[PDB]
């Protein structure tokens, strides 16, 4: 509530949200010789060392990270906590049996600690997290995040049909369990609840009606589901909800579109669906790694810009094979090159930080070093491979340095992770 922390090094952030990718250059700030001052888990002051250093009393030691890159904490807008151990239709062989283990509270506790360590080790300070059907396991996840005062959005999976009996809830149990978790965890410190129907195929009309009820009763909770990942899933949803005008219309007619409504994947959207997401101000989680690993297809980021739809990056751990947001951006580059779309390092860095924060409606809280922002940040270095150090040494522009961090970065690039203005992870 009191003492100042002073962090010195080279900082990169985007200073405001934008509407066109061509505007990112104008919003990007690089301070090679920067100073970040932290008070009460927030940015007190940020800018040039020479402009700010006079504020540092002799009673305080400077944390010197000169030679490293310091960026805002990465934002993962779609990840499954109970799928860390998962290795490769898919649902019945892999997802469901893996998730089954998280009924054991002691397993859920151990894996909550492992899950949070994996995010911090990868520089992820905020995530929108799929829990389990089991509410004990969402408690374990929130308890782990709560210990370090992490800003995390999570929820109990709602799933009453078309899956194994060991993983089914009911419409009613899914209402009461979600409400009780909302009551314990929503706006509990920096924690936030998302109403999390797995997706249309595994939720009865009765359960969709409960999800709608929860959103009506708790207007400031998040909504988090899957949307149009694969053509079979879309066909299956149309066959189960034939009176609705396609997949998104199911969620829309049940009042689950709007501000802080996050749809994962959105690979195979109709024109009408793109416009609905735009009009509702609903959010997409672009999950390139799983989209390639399952051969789901190529997310049209160009169209999302055209349609002014909020996009954040998701790892979709489980189906995606990395926690790392730099590797996720690398896969985004690959997905986009196959569409002849050239993802700039500026745009990638935007999507990983303030862009994703905007997609979760948290851009007033995190995502750059503006005064008043929550002090979540990552000390990075290009030391992952000798090849990364070589390419970084041969880089002179900020775009080239960002590019080397994106294309050859992994967990070894993350030196330190700060959550709530406190050191919560060192590499070693």
Q: Select the residue interacting with a second copy from 17, 84, 136, 204 (CB under 8 A).
A: 84
Q: Select the residue interacting with a second copy from 57, 67, 242, 340 (CB under 8 A).
A: 340
CB of 271 to a second copy, least distance (A): 23
Query: Helices 325-337 and 345-352: crossing angle, nearest 10°?
Result: 130
Query: Would you list which residues are annotated within the binding site for Zn(2+)?
Result: 78, 80, 226, 316
Residue 206 binds which entry of a second copy, Zn ion, none, CB below 5-8 Å type-dependent: none
Main-chain dihedrals φ then ψ at residue 104, nearest 5 degrees? -65, 115
Question: Applying CB under 8 A, does 114 fall inside the site for a second copy?
Answer: yes
65 or 199: whose CB is closer to Zn ion? Answer: 199
Residue 316 binds which entry of a second copy, Zn ion, none, CB below 5-8 Å type-dependent: Zn ion
| DSSP type of residue 374 | B
In order, the DSSP letters of 91-139 are: IIIIIHHHHHGGGSHHHHHHHHHHHHHHHHHTTEEEEEEE--SSHHHHH
43 or 167: whose CB is closer to a second copy? Answer: 167
Longest dimension (CA), the chain: 70
Query: Would you list which residues are annotated within the binding site?
Result: 78, 80-83, 198-199, 226-229, 316
Main-chain dihedrals φ then ψ at residue 202, nearest 5 degrees? -105, 10
Which residues in 309-338 contact a second copy (CB under 8 A)? 321-323, 330, 333-334, 337-338
Q: Select the residue interacting with a second copy from 292, 303, 307, 427 (CB under 8 A).
A: 292
Question: Applying CB under 8 A, does 393 fall inside the site for a second copy?
Answer: yes
Question: Applying CB under 8 A, does 344 fall inside the site for a second copy?
Answer: no
- The rounded distance, in Å, linking the Cα atoms of 226 and 389 is 38
Q: How many residues lie near a second copy (CB under 8 A)? A: 40
The interface region with a second copy, picked from 20-28, 39-47, 358-366, 384-392 by CB under 8 A, is 384-392
Q: Which residue in 229, 167, 238 sits closest to 201, CA to CA?
A: 238
Dihedral (CA of 219, 186, 206, 201) sign = positive
CB of 223 to Zn ion, least distance (A): 14
Answer yes or no: are the C-beta atoms of 335 and 341 closer than 8 Å: no
The interface region with a second copy, picked from 144-152, 201-209, 242-250, 287-295 by CB under 8 A, is 287-295
Answer yes or no: are the C-beta atoms of 359 and 158 closer than 8 Å: no
List residues binding Zn ion (CB under 5 A). Answer: 264, 316
Answer yes or no: are the C-beta atoms of 150 and 419 closer than 8 Å: yes
| Three-state secondary-structure class, residue 311 | strand
239 or 394: whose CB is closer to a second copy? Answer: 394
188 or 337: whose CB is closer to a second copy? Answer: 337
CB of 160 to Zn ion, least distance (A): 18
Query: What character string, x for contact with a second copy (CB under 8 A) and - otherwise, covers 34-73?
Result: ----------------------------------------
Query: What character string, x for contact with a second copy (CB under 8 A) and - otherwise, covers 407-426?
Result: xx-xx---------------
The interface region with a second copy, picked from 54-62, 81-89, 137-145, 349-357 by CB under 8 A, is 81-89
Strands 42-48 and 28-39: antiparallel
Burial class (CB in 10 A: 0-12, 13-18, 19+), 342: exposed
- The rounded distance, in Å, linking the Cα atoms of 144 and 82 is 14
Q: Select the residue interacting with a second copy from 70, 86, 267, 375 (CB under 8 A).
A: 86
Answer yes or no: are the C-beta atoms of 391 and 385 closer than 8 Å: no
- Joined together, the tokens standing for residue 239 give 């066959």
- The rounded distance, in Å, linking the Cα atoms of 158 and 231 is 23
Query: Would you list which residues are annotated within the binding site for substrate?
Result: 80-83, 198-199, 226-229, 316
- The torsion of the CA quartet 348, 193, 79, 379, rounded to 10 degrees, works out to 50
Which residues in 167-226 contact a second copy (CB under 8 A)? none
**Using CB under 8 A as the criterion, which residues of the chain lie in contact with a second copy when the complex forms?**
84-88, 114, 117-118, 121, 292-295, 297, 321-323, 330, 333-334, 337-340, 342, 385-387, 390-391, 393-395, 400, 403-404, 407-408, 410-411
């Amino acid at each position: 509530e009191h003492t100042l922390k002073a962090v010195r090094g080279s900082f990169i952030d985007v200073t405001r949200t934008i509407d066109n990718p061509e505007e990112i250059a104008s919003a990007l700030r690089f301070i090679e010789d920067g100073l970040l001052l932290i008070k009460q888990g927030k940015v007190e002051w940020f800018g040039e060392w020479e402009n700010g250093k006079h504020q540092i009393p002799d009673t305080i030691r400077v944390r010197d990270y000169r030679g490293k890159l310091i960026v805002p904490g990465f934002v993962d807008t779609h990840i499954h906590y109970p799928q860390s151990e998962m290795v490769g239709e898919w649902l019945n062989k892999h997802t469901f049996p893996t998730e089954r283990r998280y009924e054991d509270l002691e397993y859920a506790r151990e894996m909550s600690a492992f899950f949070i360590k994996q995010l911090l080790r990868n520089g992820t300070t905020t995530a929108l997290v799929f829990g389990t059907v089991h509410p004990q396991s969402v408690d374990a996840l929130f308890e782990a995040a709560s210990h370090i005062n992490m800003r995390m959005i999570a929820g109990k999976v709602m799933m009453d049909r078309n899956a194994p009996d060991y993983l089914l809830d009911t419409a009613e149990s899914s209402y009461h369990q979600s409400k009780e978790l909302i009551e314990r965890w929503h706006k509990n410190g920096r924690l936030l609840y998302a109403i999390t129907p797995r997706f249309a195929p595994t939720s009865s009309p009765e359960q969709m009606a409960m999800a709608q009820r929860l959103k009506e009763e708790y207007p400031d909770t998040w909504v988090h589901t899957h949307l149009c990942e694969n053509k079979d899933e879309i066909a299956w949803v149309k066959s189960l909800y034939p009176d609705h005008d396609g997949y998104l219309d199911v969620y829309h007619q049940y009042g689950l579109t709007g501000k802080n409504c996050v749809f994962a994947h959105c690979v195979h959207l109709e024109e009408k669906e793109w416009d609905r997401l735009s009009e509702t101000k609903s959010s997409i989680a672009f999950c390139p790694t799983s989209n390639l690993y399952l051969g789901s297809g190529l997310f049209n980021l160009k169209k999302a810009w055209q349609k002014k739809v909020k996009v954040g990056m998701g790892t979709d751990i489980g189906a995606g094979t990395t926690f790392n947001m730099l590797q996720t951006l690398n896969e985004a580059y690959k997905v986009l090159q196959l569409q002849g779309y050239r993802l700039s390092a500026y745009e990638a860095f935007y999507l990983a930080t303030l862009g994703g924060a905007k997609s979760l409606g948290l851009d007033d809280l995190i995502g750059n070093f503006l005064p008043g922002k929550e002090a979540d940040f990552v000390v990075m270095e290009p030391t992952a491979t000798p090849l990364q150090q070589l390419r970084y040494d041969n880089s002179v522009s900020l775009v080239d340095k960002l590019f080397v961090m994106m294309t050859l970065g992994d967990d070894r690039s993350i030196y330190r992770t700060y959550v709530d203005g406190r050191l919560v992870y060192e590499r070693n």
